[PDB]
Design an enzyme around this catalytic site. Structure first.
Site, mmCIF file in Angstrom:
data_model
loop_
_atom_site.group_PDB
_atom_site.id
_atom_site.type_symbol
_atom_site.label_atom_id
_atom_site.label_comp_id
_atom_site.label_asym_id
_atom_site.label_seq_id
_atom_site.Cartn_x
_atom_site.Cartn_y
_atom_site.Cartn_z
ATOM 1 N N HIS A 60 45.875 48.972 15.132
ATOM 2 C CA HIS A 60 44.733 48.071 15.279
ATOM 3 C C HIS A 60 44.729 47.065 14.135
ATOM 4 C CE1 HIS A 60 40.923 46.599 16.694
ATOM 5 N NE2 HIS A 60 40.395 46.766 15.494
ATOM 6 N N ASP A 62 43.173 43.553 12.581
ATOM 7 C CA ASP A 62 42.029 42.644 12.576
ATOM 8 C C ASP A 62 42.381 41.237 12.047
ATOM 9 O OD1 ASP A 62 40.013 44.469 13.433
ATOM 10 O OD2 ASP A 62 40.151 45.448 11.491
ATOM 11 N N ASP A 174 37.874 48.402 19.637
ATOM 12 C CA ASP A 174 36.949 48.294 18.504
ATOM 13 C C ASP A 174 35.646 47.500 18.651
ATOM 14 O OD1 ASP A 174 37.273 47.880 14.867
ATOM 15 O OD2 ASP A 174 36.619 49.628 16.037
ATOM 16 N N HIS A 441 36.152 40.473 16.907
ATOM 17 C CA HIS A 441 35.009 41.358 16.701
ATOM 18 C C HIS A 441 34.523 41.544 15.228
ATOM 19 C CE1 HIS A 441 38.666 43.843 16.965
ATOM 20 N NE2 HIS A 441 38.097 44.552 16.007
HETATM 21 ZN ZN LIG Z 1 38.878 45.817 14.410
#
Ligand SMILES: [Zn+2]
Ligand SMILES: *[C@H]1O[C@H](CO)[C@@H](O)[C@H](O)[C@H]1NC(C)=O
EC number: 3.2.1.114
Length: 1014
Positions: A60, A62, A174, A441
């Site tokens: 994951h 970001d 997420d 997000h």
């Molecule tokens: Zn995230």
């Protein structure tokens, strides 16, 4: 066309209904803290029915959170991708899924040609698979569906072009709660499956018990089910390894081989992982297979999904090895031990879904249908994630502004094909990408660290400038005699004038049109209307003299109103908040009339004295102890008085009454009708002194809000023939109610200053008998019915208000429309409330590592619509949806997609024309051309232009509303040779259209068309 109002869809799970029945008790369920001890019948699987297990490696990443996009790329992501390329290339059976194209595109373009080919081959052969394929994995609460489509299209267009693949499975692990707007867009973009993770722990438990974690998610109004998209909800608390192998994290943690020590990670359950060997593999497999079979009991087929990853994982080669080798040892033993009746292997997300459907087709399972959303999320106890519906509101407002600039820039420049030297494609791509990035997000959610938020702001700022450049070059070309048009692609022919962003009191960024007998007698201004129907709207500009008149290009006079330029100051000396008027600049206001998707030119001319078609507003300052307020040449002297109630009426519009504190008190729709009680009030929520603290994610109020003490505020009343307003300087907010003849516009200049641990809310109190029902929208796409539940804590009854909310009874409705996503609710019958800003000193333990103390002045805008709905044809009481009226819908459009204003920069505009688009069809009011984008560069023999058409659904309330033209976007440009219906991303042709005519869409539907021109 399906009826989206009168037929209540029949579904196995309807989320509002489920919420009504669920108890939400937070009991200790054992090792599966929020569930129960899963039991299974070992005889369920046998040689003729094995459990097929797919372990899916993932990381994951970001695009900014704790570090900026670029910091993460340099520090982690480029290493993750570089090692993924090496490791998958060298281990044919290893698999990996990737979601964020923003990072992948950045990486790929930096690769040498030899590695680009290696990468393309491990993608082509199925080892590395893209899931969703969007520029980011967006927030689903605050994001506008238009930007969700924009970012999806940006990533998928890149993927088709360079990787020659289009994902049909989505992966969203997420975002904080999930919206049905995702399957809506995905299903209309070729997707066949999707996966979600962050949903309320009570919901997970409930669906798990009924094996309804996999379902066909259709829209709440979809009676037929054609909007359905197969959805897999993960069952546990997290997507990390401890919470993905089965119900017991103490056991699963032992199978995250990165937690043995050398990597600086460990298992919080105190049992560490152990390297697999021939001496322990049987016992390790016993434990693992038991977790897997327990997890399998929660689903309906014999195909099991086991995600294997966490945040920024698979960074080091040694990590790839430790995870791969140990799992290969487990698979070899497990698959060769018939008594387990399991076949496990590494796999991708699509492999999992294909196997599931194969089981489905073999008749081994049938899936339940579901409609509804998954807000508001709580990961544990009473920790509801409704704070992020408001966090960093400045950038949430900025998101909507850029959303519109991007659409206007793409539309205005789509009309022509441009020479590469114009750098149109370049500027548009950069703007689409920075806005797409912010959909992340941790972007629009306001959940990133301070310096990261600054980075998103600077990126969006550059995106706004790029849009302006494209828009003004476009206007210049569109409105200049062709044989005179001589462009300098780096020159600014017009400067954009935006009255609401950054907004008055936020930044003095607007330019004053400087006129004068000894300098310049007049100035051309141009308005653009991105909406596909004729539109009238008041527009204002700053001018250096009050003696200015307006005319159109046929030289017909246009009625105008001049008002002072008022700025509010917190006087640190007198300790009051009062307005000061400019003695050198003034506001001129007039009604612009612009063609559908067109332009209209006007001229402002200075006069030596009051012109015939310009009126001047009166101004009244109400406060005790007043002092003079001179206004230079302004012809009307400001009047003063002690605070007192006031009433105003503009045009034939409603009459509004205000209290002596400058706050709305009542609305009277017509001459005769009653003064309906509608009161604005400002309150504040605090933070708990013991227990969990509110932060960027969590809203944990220390009880119901308390009124903000107003003291004796200064109230300014401006009364004009075209526009009147009442403004008051309250603590933390300059609140303004503006009237132009219809539903008033509300503007709040919010400066929470240094009031720590405070959340400012704006509330409306009415006598509407709404009970426990209210409506809020989902991504500016649909309105969903909400039911206030007293069995849940206050913060749980907060929902995202991305663009609007309303309450109603049998006869009356009050709708509040927003120009920015914020959090809100209806905590009592007849009430509406929406949070303005929040400043929190503490971190809320979700990893951000800081509170929210970087607040800055923001100008929130709204439209407040009070209407009678007793004659409206509404959905029955059991329908989960709600619909706006024509007035409420147009009010939303006035906030999100206002006319664009351009001021000509040089003294003379040679070749100027007065209008563009006068022949464009003026489509029915519920239809919009959401996107107009030229898809080909000038060197393409066959030009192509893409259009996204959306039709909303408005209530039938007895208004005849007639005469409109059919809009065929395929004929908006000449020489059309072909017209095709395509997926919303324009990547796949779905239908070849007869007569090259793009038919209009049905209520609540969205379609995309591409016209080809020779
Ligand atoms: Zn995230
Ligand atoms: C990849 O796309 C298709 C497979 O769907 C394949 O036939 C084609 O050769 C590839 N695209 C290219 C390189 O044009």
């Amino acid at each position: 066309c399906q009826d989206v109002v009168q037929d209540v869809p029949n579904v196995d799970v309807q989320m509002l209904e489920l919420y009504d029945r669920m108890s939400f008790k937070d009991i200790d369920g054992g090792v599966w803290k929020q569930g129960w001890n899963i039991k299974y019948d070992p005889l369920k699987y046998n040689a003729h029915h094995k459990l097929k297990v797919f372990v899916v490696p993932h990381s994951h990443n970001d695009p900014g959170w704790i570090q900026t996009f670029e910091e993460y790329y340099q520090h982690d992501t480029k290493h993750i991708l570089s090692n993924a390329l090496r490791h998958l290339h060298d281990n044919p059976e290893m698999k990996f899924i990737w979601a964020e194209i923003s990072y992948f595109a950045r990486f790929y373009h930096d690769l040498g040609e030899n590695k680009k080919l290696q990468m393309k081959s491990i993608v082509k052969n199925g080892q590395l698979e893209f899931v969703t394929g969007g520029w980011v994995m967006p927030d689903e609460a605050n994001s506008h569906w238009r930007n969700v489509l924009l970012q999806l299209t940006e990533g998928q267009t890149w993927l088709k072009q360079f990787m020659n693949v289009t994902p049909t499975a989505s992966w969203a692990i997420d975002p904080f709660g999930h919206s049905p707007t995702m399957p809506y867009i995905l299903q209309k973009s070729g997707f066949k499956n999707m996966l979600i993770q962050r949903t309320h722990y009570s919901v997970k438990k409930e669906l798990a018990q009924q094996r309804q974690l996999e379902f066909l998610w259709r829209q709440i109004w979809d009676n037929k089910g054609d909007t359905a998209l197969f959805t897999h909800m993960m069952p546990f608390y997290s997507y990390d390894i401890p919470h993905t192998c089965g119900p017991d994290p103490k056991v699963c943690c032992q199978f995250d081989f990165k937690r043995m020590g050398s990597f600086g990670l460990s298992c919080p359950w105190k049992v560490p992982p152990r390297t697999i060997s021939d001496q322990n593999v049987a016992a390790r497999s016993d434990l693992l297979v038991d977790q897997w079979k327990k997890k399998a009991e929660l689903y309906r087929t014999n195909v099991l999904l086991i995600p294997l990853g966490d945040n920024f994982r698979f960074k080091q080669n040694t990590e790839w090895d430790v995870q791969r080798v140990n799992y290969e040892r487990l698979f070899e033993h497990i698959n060769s031990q018939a008594h387990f009746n399991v076949q496990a292997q590494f796999g991708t997300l699509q492999e999992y879904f294909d196997a599931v459907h194969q089981a489905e087709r073999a008749g081994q399972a049938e899936f339940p249908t579901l409609s509804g959303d998954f807000f508001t999320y709580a990961d544990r106890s009473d920790n509801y994630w409704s704070g992020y519906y408001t966090s960093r509101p400045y950038h949430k407002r900025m998101d909507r502004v850029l959303m519109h600039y991007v659409r206007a820039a793409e539309m205005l420049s789509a009309w022509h094909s441009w020479d590469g030297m114009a750098r149109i494609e370049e500027r548009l791509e950069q703007a689409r990408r920075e806005l797409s990035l912010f959909q992340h997000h941790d972007g629009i959610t306001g959940t990133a660290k301070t310096h990261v938020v600054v980075d998103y702001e600077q990126r969006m700022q550059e995106a706004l400038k790029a849009c302006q450049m494209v828009m003004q070059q476009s206007v210049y070309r569109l409105l200049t005699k062709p044989s005179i048009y001589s462009p300098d692609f780096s020159f600014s022919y017009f400067t954009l004038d935006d009255s609401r962003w950054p907004g008055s009191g936020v930044e003095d960024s607007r330019t004053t049109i400087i006129l004068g007998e000894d300098i310049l007698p007049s100035k051309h201004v141009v308005m653009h209307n991105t909406l596909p129907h004729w539109r009238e709207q008041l527009v204002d500009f700053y001018v250096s003299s009050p003696f200015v008149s307006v005319t159109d290009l046929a030289n017909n006079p246009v009625e105008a109103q001049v008002s002072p330029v008022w700025s509010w100051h917190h006087d640190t000396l007198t300790k009051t908040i009062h307005p000061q008027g400019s003695t050198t600049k003034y506001r001129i206001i007039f009604k612009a009339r612009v063609p559908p998707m067109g332009l209209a030119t006007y001229v402002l001319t200075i006069s030596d004295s009051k012109p015939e078609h310009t009126s001047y507003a009166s101004n009244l300052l109400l406060r005790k102890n007043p002092t003079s307020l001179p206004l230079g040449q302004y012809p009307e002297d400001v009047k003063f008085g002690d605070p007192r109630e006031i009433s105003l009426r503009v045009g034939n519009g409603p009459t509004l009454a205000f209290s002596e504190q400058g706050l709305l008190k009542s609305i009277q729709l017509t001459q005769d009708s009653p003064h309906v009680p509608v009161h604005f009030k400002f309150l504040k929520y605090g933070v708990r002194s013991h227990g969990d603290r509110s932060g960027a994610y969590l809203f944990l109020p220390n009880g119901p809000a308390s009124p903000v003490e107003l003291g004796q505020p200064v109230v300014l009343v401006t009364k004009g023939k075209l526009e009147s307003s009442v403004s008051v300087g309250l603590p933390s907010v300059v609140h303004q109610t503006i009237m132009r003849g219809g539903a008033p516009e509300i503007r709040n200049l919010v400066d929470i200053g240094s009031l720590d641990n405070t959340e400012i809310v704006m509330r409306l109190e009415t006598h509407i008998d709404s009970g426990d029902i209210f409506y809020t929208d989902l991504n500016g796409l649909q309105f969903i019915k909400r039911r206030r539940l007293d069995k849940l804590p206050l913060q749980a009854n907060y929902y995202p208000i991305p663009s609007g909310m309303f309450i109603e009874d049998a006869n009356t409705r009050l709708t509040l429309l927003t120009g920015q996503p914020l959090g809100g609710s209806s905590l009592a019958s007849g009430e509406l409330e929406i949070m303005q800003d929040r400043r929190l000193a503490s971190d809320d333990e979700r990893g951000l590592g800081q509170g929210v103390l970087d607040n800055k002045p923001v100008l929130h805008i709204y439209r407040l619509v009070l209407e009678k709905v007793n004659n409206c044809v509404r959905p029955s009481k059991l329908h989960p949806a709600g619909y706006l009226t024509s007035a409420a819908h147009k009010a939303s459009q006035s906030l999100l997609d206002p006319l664009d204003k351009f001021i000509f920069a040089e003294n003379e505009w040679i070749g100027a024309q007065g209008q563009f688009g006068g022949d464009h069809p003026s489509a029915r009011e519920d239809l919009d051309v959401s996107v107009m984008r030229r898809l080909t560069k000038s060197s393409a023999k066959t030009q192509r232009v893409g259009y996204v058409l959306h039709r909303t659904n408005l209530m039938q309330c007895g208004t005849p509303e007639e005469h409109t033209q059919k809009l065929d976007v395929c004929h908006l440009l000449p020489n059309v040779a072909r017209c095709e219906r395509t997926t919303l991303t324009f990547l796949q042709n779905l239908e070849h259209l007869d007569g090259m005519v793009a038919p209009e869409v049905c209520p609540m539907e969205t379609a995309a068309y591409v016209s080809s021109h020779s």
